[PDB]
Amino acid sequence: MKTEWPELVGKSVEEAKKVILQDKPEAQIIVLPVGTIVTMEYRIDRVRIFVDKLDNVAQVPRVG
Amino acid sequence: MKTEWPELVGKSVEEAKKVILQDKPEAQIIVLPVGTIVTMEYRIDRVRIFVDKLDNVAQVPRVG
Amino acid sequence: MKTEWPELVGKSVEEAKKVILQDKPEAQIIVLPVGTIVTMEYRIDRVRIFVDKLDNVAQVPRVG
Amino acid sequence: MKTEWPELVGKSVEEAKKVILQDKPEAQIIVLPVGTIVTMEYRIDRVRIFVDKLDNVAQVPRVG
Amino acid sequence: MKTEWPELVGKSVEEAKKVILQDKPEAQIIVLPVGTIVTMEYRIDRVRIFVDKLDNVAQVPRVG
Amino acid sequence: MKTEWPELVGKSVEEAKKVILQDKPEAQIIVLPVGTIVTMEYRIDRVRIFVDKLDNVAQVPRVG
Amino acid sequence: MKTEWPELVGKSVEEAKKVILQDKPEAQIIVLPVGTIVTMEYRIDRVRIFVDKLDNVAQVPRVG
Amino acid sequence: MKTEWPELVGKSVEEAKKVILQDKPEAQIIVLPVGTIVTMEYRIDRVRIFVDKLDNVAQVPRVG
Amino acid sequence: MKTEWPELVGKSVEEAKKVILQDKPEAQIIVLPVGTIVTMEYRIDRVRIFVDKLDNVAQVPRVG
Amino acid sequence: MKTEWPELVGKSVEEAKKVILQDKPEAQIIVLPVGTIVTMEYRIDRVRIFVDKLDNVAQVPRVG
Amino acid sequence: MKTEWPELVGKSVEEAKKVILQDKPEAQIIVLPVGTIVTMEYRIDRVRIFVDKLDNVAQVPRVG
Amino acid sequence: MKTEWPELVGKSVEEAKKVILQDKPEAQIIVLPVGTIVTMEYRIDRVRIFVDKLDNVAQVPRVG
């Protein structure tokens, strides 16, 4: 099962969403600033994308 | 009593509000950024929705 | 002496202000985001309202 | 020496500035959000005003 | 060597920049909100200016 | 291998990006506010730029 | 249903536990330092006691 | 698959460990203070237990 | 009504407690480290004392 | 090059150190509480181990 | 008026206290860990000393 | 001028102090936990050492 998207570091939110949904059609994509504190439980259908000030992907997106 | 809405993860605030009010007509719906610190008491009529940068539901909304 | 306004959870800032001033004509109403850190002293004429992202009342307003 | 302005709680920044400068013509007035962390040294000519989301004075302004 | 600018407390960013560059032509001027956390190393050509909500200088600018 | 860009302190994001990509054509450039908390792993192709309120480079950009 | 114990402010943990269990025999009593950050869900059988440096009750214990 | 242990709220670490290992023989049990910030990835064999000042279980232990 | 004890800055907890109880026989005295975050409501019978590493009073004790 | 030690989650510091040094004889092993904030640069010879209240490994140790 | 003690950086608490009281007989000396958050008002008779893990003076003690 | 001690990562406080004082006889050595927040000014005679739970050097010691 695909769980990580290193290839998306540096790319835009739009490009990330497109790629993640090709790979994971059920993905529930959540867009948060880097450094956001995240007390969450694990959701196998969720993919969190941490973005910079310019809404580029700053860290490897991972399922959960 | 309905207490959680896992089906709303990833959906918009508007869609969440609509669904929560169908299920819980008395709901007092509060919209906060993920990571907001929450020193609150329990209110059975309140539903907090934690949203991402795009005002999508990021975490399962729960009564309280 | 009226000290709390549970009836205002979920309502707008405008509606809250109107109700608080009917009940407490001398009120000095302060509007802050939920989670704001509050190292304050007690002021009997002040009412702090903690609001969500949509400027709705998120927590019971209390004198102080 | 005037050091505090309790009478300004709840008032606007503009009204606060006007009153503080009548009382303290040399005042260097600094406007910060409530909860801002303040590791400062003491300046006798400075007056910090802590304001709410609506740029109303939320706490008693004090010299320093 | 000039290392501090107490005379700039309360002044605008534009006035501060002008004065700092007259005094220190090589200055690399960085503008940050008060309370920003600053884990930095020492740079002799840098001057950080901490500003309030109105982009006025809130604290004595210092080299480093 | 070039790992740091001290020469970019004080410069704009646009100038920084241009210089970093001349030096490191594969760079994945991420733009964050100073003070952002950064729990990241090491990526040799990434360069994080920490910027001030005016989107000037505030700290030496480094690979990772 | 008893939900708060104002009478226990200032008392020891031992005295608090004794009183809470007389009033609420099923209580699951949790002892935390004041200021502890509490991202919890509501448990009707739990009573959190916030204590000072001397393990005295510092704030009104409440169910949840 | 057992994922939560509500029955352990209020119990000691020793009793929790015993019960979790009966239910989940492969469990890797981690004991942390309530409020600890937890930027972790999901591990299906891990169970985190959040404890109070007296090393009693303060919150429902969950796999991850 | 006595509300503040400036005379106790620098004194020990034991001396502070003695003086506060002479002045305020009903006082519920709470001892916390400086910097403790305090999201509390106002209690007219409570006096919080903020202490240093040596359990000396570091800040003016005040009712509330 | 070995960069991660998932097999050490849940084990003691002593066992972790032994295993990491078998795999990486030059390792500079650093032991920190979970949640410690880590503004560090990348060191290829360092391995940070994040431990729980009982000095067990709480998270996968990684080079850097 | 003596307001700072640069000569005490690196010295013990005992040596600092001795020197500060020679210079300032009325000093109310408060000993805090580095990084302690300090929302205080200005007291001309107080001297705060910020100490390291070994109770050595880590930063220049200053009146206030 | 020696400004950094990479060779001391992983070593004890005692060994670090010995080496730093051989290299810098005037050093004022300050020992702090990793993650300590450090709002300091630059002191050319100071060397801060950030240590882990076992009082080993966790990060490169640097003058300032």
Residue numbers in the entry:
A (entry chain A), B (entry chain A), C (entry chain A), D (entry chain A), E (entry chain A), F (entry chain A), ...: 1 to 64
Question: Would you copy out the relevant sentences from the publication that reported this structure?
Answer:
CI2 is a small single domain protein of 64 residues, which has been extensively used as a model to understand key concepts of protein folding and stability. L49 and I57 are both part of the folding nucleus in CI2 and very important for the stability of the folded state of CI232. Here, we have applied an efficient in-cell assay in E. coli to select variants of the barley chymotrypsin inhibitor 2 with increased stability. We, therefore, determined the crystal structures of all four CI2 variants in the wild-type to L49I/I57V double mutant cycle.
Still, we found two variants, L49I/I57V and D55G, that are significantly stabilized relative to wild-type CI2. For L49I/I57V we find that there is a strong positive synergistic effect between the two substitutions and this variant is stabilized by 5.1 kJ mol−1 more than the sum of the individual effects of the two single variants. Overall, the structures of L49I, I57V and L49I/I57V are highly similar to the structure of the wild-type with RMSDs for the backbone of 0.16, 0.45 and 0.17 Å. Around the mutated residues the structural changes are minimal. The Val at position 57 in I57V and L49I/I57V superimpose, except for the missing δ1 methyl group, with the Ile at position 57 in the wild-type and L49I. The minor conformation, accounting for roughly 30% of the electron density, has a conformation similar to that seen in L49I. In the major conformation that accounts of the remaining 70% of the electron density, the γ2 methyl is rotated approximately 120° and points towards the position where the δ1 methyl group of the Ile at position 57 would be in the wild-type structure.
